[PDB]
């Protein structure tokens, strides 16, 4: 079920079982890498880059292509971005959660009586703390990193 | 409304703690561990006791029965506490006099309390003046 609402929505993606890219893919690995870097320069997130590639360029997914520089792993948008030195400084989902938490706090400062929005903010902050703990364990950010409502504005 | 917990391989501490916590809801175990009976027992945890008769009284039979049950008030030599002792026998009362030494013994009611239609009385006379009340009632022996 959902993390907080405890509902059982099942909408999602159902990809076919595949191990190699489909033949009808027009572009090659290098061309799709260039397209990914071009979209990142345009200023899209990883998810939006993948969606654009799937919709406009007819690329079902970059994960189907084997990584030329590492036979032991498949390609990935984040891996391509870090190869070209454009990966996020901090995780994108955490960034989005922090951004909307800051916006919610700004709204609550003007509307102190919005207790339901306050509860939503509390849930958002719990999710942020969960992500911070996970990334601390995996070493994706400094061990002393802590989420501060005051300091989060600078990150935003 | 769920699988009784904990059931993990490494939950022995929590399982033992839960058992210890919930064993206190048992009245018998709580009484035994805290020695509650010995704290308030007039006989101080003894099978029988000795005392001196202070007066002879009679108690009404509990409903729906009817009748007068003859008993005595006995002062224990152990601590001087005064208790009521039932006098079993058809005519046991006539064999007991004031300021006589009597050995009282628990009454075999539920748990350790009163029995039958005489609530409140927890003890019964056995020997009076070092002679058995049953023998006195049956008439083979004589009161000294």
């Amino acid at each position: 079920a959902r993390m907080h609402a405890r509902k059982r929505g099942k909408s999602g993606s159902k990809r076919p079982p595949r191990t190699a890219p489909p033949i009808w893919v027009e572009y090659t690995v290098e061309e799709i890498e260039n397209l990914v870097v071009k979209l990142r320069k345009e200023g899209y997130s990883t998810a939006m880059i993948g969606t654009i590639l799937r919709d406009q360029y007819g690329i079902p997914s970059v994960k189907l292509f084997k990584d030329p520089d590492n036979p032991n792993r498949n390609l990935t948008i984040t891996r391509i971005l870090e190869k070209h030195g454009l990966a996020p400084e901090i995780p994108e989902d955490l960034m989005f959660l922090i951004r909307r938490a800051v916006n919610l706090r700004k709204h609550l400062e003007q509307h102190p009586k919005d207790l339901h929005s306050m509860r939503g903010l509390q849930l958002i902050e719990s999710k942020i703390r969960r992500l911070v703990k996970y990334y601390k364990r995996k070493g994706k950010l400094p061990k002393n990193w802590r989420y501060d409502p005051e300091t989060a504005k600078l990150l935003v | 409304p769920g699988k009784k917990a904990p059931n993990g391989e490494f939950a022995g501490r929590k399982l033992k703690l839960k058992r210890k916590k919930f064993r206190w809801s048992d009245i018998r175990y709580k009484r035994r561990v805290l020695r509650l009976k010995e704290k308030s027992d007039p006989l101080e945890g003894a099978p029988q006791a000795r005392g001196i008769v202070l007066e002879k009284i009679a108690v009404e039979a509990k409903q729906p029965n009817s009748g007068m049950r003859k008993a005595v008030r006995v002062q224990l030599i152990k601590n001087g506490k005064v208790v009521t002792a039932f006098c079993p026998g058809d005519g046991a009362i006539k064999f007991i006099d004031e300021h006589d030494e009597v050995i009282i013994e628990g009454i075999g009611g539920p748990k350790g309390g009163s029995m039958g239609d005489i609530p409140g009385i927890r003890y019964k006379v056995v020997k009076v003046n070092r002679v058995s009340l049953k023998e006195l009632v049956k008439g083979r022996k004589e009161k000294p």
Partner: protein, 129 residues
């Protein structure tokens, strides 16, 4: 959330057998489940089974012969020595050598009778009868 796929599989097998289903599907697939199914087939409690790839952990298709009275995982996975099998047999089976206690040992998973024959112990991971 999902905790023990093996327990899920065994419970599903028992549930579907009680209503007489001829075929069952076990999801997700794991090598422990595969070995347990292999042991059950060897002892004749199930029919043919196969592994299906689906881009995920995988699936198992299993045929039921209407022979299982009850099958279930054992948890916690109690460790057991060679000389400490009678108590577990009495606990989990109706009669001596009636069912099979699936045990994971240092030499793979096998029936408790096979473990006794080989003179080794292990951990009790399931039971069937």
């Amino acid at each position: 959330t999902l905790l023990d796929p093996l327990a899920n599989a065994l419970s599903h097998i028992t549930n579907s057998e009680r209503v007489g289903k001829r075929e069952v599907y076990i999801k997700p697939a794991s090598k422990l489940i595969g070995e347990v199914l292999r042991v059950m087939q060897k002892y004749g409690y199930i029919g043919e089974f196969e592994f299906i790839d689906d881009g995920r952990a995988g699936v198992y298709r299993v045929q039921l012969l209407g022979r299982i009275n009850k099958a279930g995982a054992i948890k916690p996975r109690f460790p057991v020595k060679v000389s400490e099998f009678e108590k577990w047999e009495k606990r989990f089976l109706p009669a001596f050598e009636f069912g099979i206690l699936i045990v994971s040992t240092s030499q793979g998973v096998m029936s408790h009778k096979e473990a006794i024959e080989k003179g080794i112990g292990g951990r009790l991971i399931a039971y069937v009868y």
